[PDB]
């Protein structure tokens, strides 16, 4: 069919990647041993997109696990679905990256990238018609941030006409203590603006706020944050994994969502979200468009929507979905740019998630995403103002010009979002 190759890099990348494979394996009826045990042929119709079929009627994720230290991938292999992954697709070093983008991008990460590229080629060469790649990683560390973006550039060199998609976890002081994350994130975003086609912005600040304020979790853990991510990743990949008319492949999704090449950073959302200590189509619609349900710490009412994709899951009235989707658009027409007519697209999938009878997934390309990049830029400049902690990076051969260039590119990206937010038709 149209195969996707999945890559997970670094600690965060491998942990959210493992949770993604657990969730969609349950949806497609695949057990930890790779055998199908579902009850619906719809589970197998597009299984080729993410799984290879091996000997013995077993399904193996088209997934590559990358890290510069063995720790996280050891726990994945010893995890719930650790036995489903191809053992030859574990590629790891020993030196680690020390939360250093330069180490991931230029030194230790560059030492290992050729070994990762070897397994990418084997998975791609066994594809009937490869459509592209999806990468899971964080931007605040060293391996997922530095080596992840190095992988993106090197893969793009060998597959320049394929779609590059990432799930990029943005750092926040509410989750991580390390001080150099604004540096690592700014250097990474500079790469993502140039070399990816579509990026889901998974903001750890939004994940924390949802767990704390909405879910009433006093001390959110990484498991709590990743629980939100796996539900979101299952939602935004539903159109790729099940028969459907809308955004059924990575390229059609990109053509619908990206009106300008650099503005390809999506705000994802999910509904319902409520604490455990306590549903209609109209309520699903209003929640999915509410700022509290967004996985990027941005208020969409502070900007305007370029494009939106909405996916409803479960058994429900399509007529009601159609009415409510046009209802929210007409009532909030100020927040959708008028010079992109019919910029909101809606899909409905009959098979709902495990524990819910109805759910909704939101994918927004909003100019309000600049609030996320402004937050990172503010933290970057507060440190770069005083050349703080730079020796970790210049010691690997980097020059200060590369920081200045990365900062200017992200400020340029912010200016671009504001330009199209202010643009008018008449």
């Amino acid at each position: 069919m149209r195969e996707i190759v999945h890559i997970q890099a670094g600690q965060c990348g491998n942990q959210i990647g493992a949770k993604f494979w657990e969730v969609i394996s349950d949806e497609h009826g695949i057990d930890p041993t790779g055998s199908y045990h579902g009850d619906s042929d719809l589970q197998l119709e597009r299984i080729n997109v993410y799984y290879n079929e091996a000997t013995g009627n077993k399904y193996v994720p088209r997934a590559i696990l990358v890290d510069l230290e063995p720790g996280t991938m050891d726990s994945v292999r010893s995890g719930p679905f650790g036995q489903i992954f191809r053992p030859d697709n574990f590629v790891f070093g020993q030196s680690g990256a020390g939360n250093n983008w330069a180490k991931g991008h230029y030194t230790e990460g560059a030492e290992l990238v050729d070994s990762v590229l070897d397994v990418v080629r084997k998975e791609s060469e066994s594809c009937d018609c490869l459509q592209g790649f999806q990468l899971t990683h964080s931007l605040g560390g060293g391996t997922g941030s530095g080596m992840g973006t190095l992988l993106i550039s090197k893969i793009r060199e060998e597959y320049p006409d394929r779609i590059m998609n990432t799930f990029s976890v943005m750092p926040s002081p509410k989750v991580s203590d390390t001080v150099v994350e604004p540096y690592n994130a700014t250097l990474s975003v500079h790469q993502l603006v140039e070399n990816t086609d579509e990026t889901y912005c998974i903001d750890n600040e939004a994940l924390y706020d949802i767990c704390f304020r909405t879910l009433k979790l006093t001390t959110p853990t990484y498991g709590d944050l990743n629980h939100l991510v796996s539900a979101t990743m299952s939602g935004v990949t539903t159109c790729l994994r099940f028969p459907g008319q809308l955004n059924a492949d990575l390229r059609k999704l990109a053509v619908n969502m990206v009106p300008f090449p650099r503005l390809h950073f999506f705000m994802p959302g999910f509904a319902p979200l409520t604490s455990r200590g306590s549903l209609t189509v109209p309520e699903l619609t209003q929640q999915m468009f509410d700022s509290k349900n967004m996985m990027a710490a941005c208020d969409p009412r502070h900007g305007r929507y370029l494009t939106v994709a909405a996916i409803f899951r479960g058994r429900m009235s399509m007529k009601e979905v159609d009415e409510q989707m046009l209802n929210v658009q007409n009532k909030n027409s100020s927040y959708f740019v008028e010079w992109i007519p019919n910029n909101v697209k809606t899909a409905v999938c009959d098979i709902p998630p495990r524990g819910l009878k109805m759910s909704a997934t939101f994918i927004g390309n909003s100019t309000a995403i600049q609030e996320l990049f402004k937050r990172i830029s503010e933290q970057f400049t507060a440190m770069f103002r005083r050349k703080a902690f730079l020796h970790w990076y210049t010691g690997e051969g980097m020059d200060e010009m590369e920081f200045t260039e990365a900062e200017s590119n992200m400020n340029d990206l912010v200016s671009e979002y504001q330009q199209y937010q202010d643009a008018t038709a008449d």
Partner: protein, 440 residues
């Protein structure tokens, strides 16, 4: 002799082709395995239905059709569907990667890899014809294959089959069932590129069909299956003159003479009646007068526009079923006294009538009631330019910001092709204004 080759391009063209060929088989008594127990001419013949069906020595009646799509999943349903035995595998052509709702990919990047094979297969069908009359091309405006590959195919057909007639059934986009933001781009690009290569194009506004299904068939949320069964009835009415013979039967090319006054002005407005549920038809017998009156209700048009705000250049009535000229003439006389029908000053005001006697039929399990008589009106009205205006306006909104244009340039297209296409549409709109201004 007088054979017609149908070409179905992309998902919309293929799925509509499925509906049309299923309906044709029911109208002609052709079984899903291609056998036709009424056709005593085994392996050949010059019957009227032979314009659309060839015949093998084993008695199979094979559609003179090619199905083409740049991805396989839609045509794969034909290969395994109820009418799989109807087609030979060579008539069903698929690639592995579609045009991604991008005209540039259907016309250039992906389409160029399969165009030669498609032409070879069309040539195989043409070689079996003793007097090929032309082609019928089914496609969407909005899809990357329906827009881009169709225009490439139409360009190549003009080279390989000179001026042999090419007619279109084109699916005009509607937001209720649209899948791509860039459909206005694809629509303008393919309309510009195909304009000089098409002799006659019947546009089908998905929103008009959607509204008819909701209003007349009580369907809450019509699907493509709902839309395509209605569309196939309209297509069948238009092609009925080619597939059946009779003494009141007027050939489509004779209607075409009246419908195309200038080469570019070749977009007839189709209106069809009656569209009625079985629960409503069970009481009423709708007369010739009632179905004829319904042809002048704008709610029954296949393209949303207001002919009361334009001028007519031609009016054709294609009846099928239990209809005699006496009742047609009385119905037309009533219509002219009570209806807003203004012609341009340079064309005759009469109505051209054809009657095909075999009654219409319906696919089992459908929503349309089986009626004793139906009618399709084909009019050439300046009001159909309203459909171009709506598309041109959505084009202008996005192109002024160059929104999504990088997807087309990335596949080798130039910005000049956008403006060249848009200027051709502007001239076409001005052409429709000019034809409707009184002489001096």
């Amino acid at each position: 002799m007088r054979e017609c080759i149908s070409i179905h391009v992309g998902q919309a063209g293929v799925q509509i082709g499925n509906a049309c060929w299923e309906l044709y088989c029911l109208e002609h008594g052709i079984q899903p395995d291609g056998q036709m127990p009424s056709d005593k001419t085994i392996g050949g013949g010059d019957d009227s239905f032979n314009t659309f069906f060839s015949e093998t020595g084993a008695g199979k009646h094979v559609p003179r059709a090619v199905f083409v799509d740049l991805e396989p999943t839609v045509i794969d349903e034909v290969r395994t569907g109820t009418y799989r035995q109807l087609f030979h595998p060579e008539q069903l052509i698929t690639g592995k990667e579609d045009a991604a709702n991008n005209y540039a990919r259907g016309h250039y990047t992906i389409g160029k890899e399969i165009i030669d094979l498609v032409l070879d297969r069309i040539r195989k069908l043409a070689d079996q014809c003793t007097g090929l009359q032309g082609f019928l091309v089914f496609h969407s405006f909005g899809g990357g294959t329906g827009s881009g590959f169709t225009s490439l195919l139409m360009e190549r057909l003009s080279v390989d089959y000179g001026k042999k007639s090419k007619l279109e059934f084109s699916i005009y986009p509607a937001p209720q069932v649209s899948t791509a933001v860039v459909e206005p781009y694809n629509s303008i690009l393919t309309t510009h590129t195909t304009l000089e290569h098409s002799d006659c194009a019947f546009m089908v506004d998905n929103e008009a069909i959607y509204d008819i299904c909701r209003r007349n068939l009580d369907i809450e949320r019509p699907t493509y299956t709902n839309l395509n069964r209605l569309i196939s009835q309209i297509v069948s009415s238009i092609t009925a003159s080619l597939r059946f013979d009779g003494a009141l039967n007027v050939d489509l090319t004779e209607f075409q003479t009246n419908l195309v006054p200038y080469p570019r002005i070749h977009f007839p407005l189709a209106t069809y009646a009656p569209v009625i549920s079985a629960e409503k038809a069970y009481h009423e017998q709708l007369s010739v007068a009632e179905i004829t009156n319904a042809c002048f209700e704008p709610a029954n048009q296949m393209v949303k526009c207001d002919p009361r705000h334009g001028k007519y250049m031609a009016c054709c009535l294609l009846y099928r079923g239990d209809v005699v000229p006496k009742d047609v003439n009385a119905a037309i006389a009533t219509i002219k006294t009570k209806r807003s029908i203004q012609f341009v000053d340079w064309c005759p005001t009469g109505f051209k009538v054809g009657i095909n006697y075999q009654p219409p039929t319906v696919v089992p399990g459908g929503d349309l009631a089986k009626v004793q008589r139906a009618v399709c009106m084909l009019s050439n009205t300046t009001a159909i330019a309203e459909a171009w205006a709506r598309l041109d306006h959505k084009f202008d909104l996005m192109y002024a910001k160059r929104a999504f244009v990088h997807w087309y340039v990335g596949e080798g297209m130039e910005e000049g092709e956008f403006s060249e296409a848009r200027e051709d549409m502007a001239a076409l709109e001005k052409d429709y204004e000019e034809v409707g201004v009184d002489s001096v």
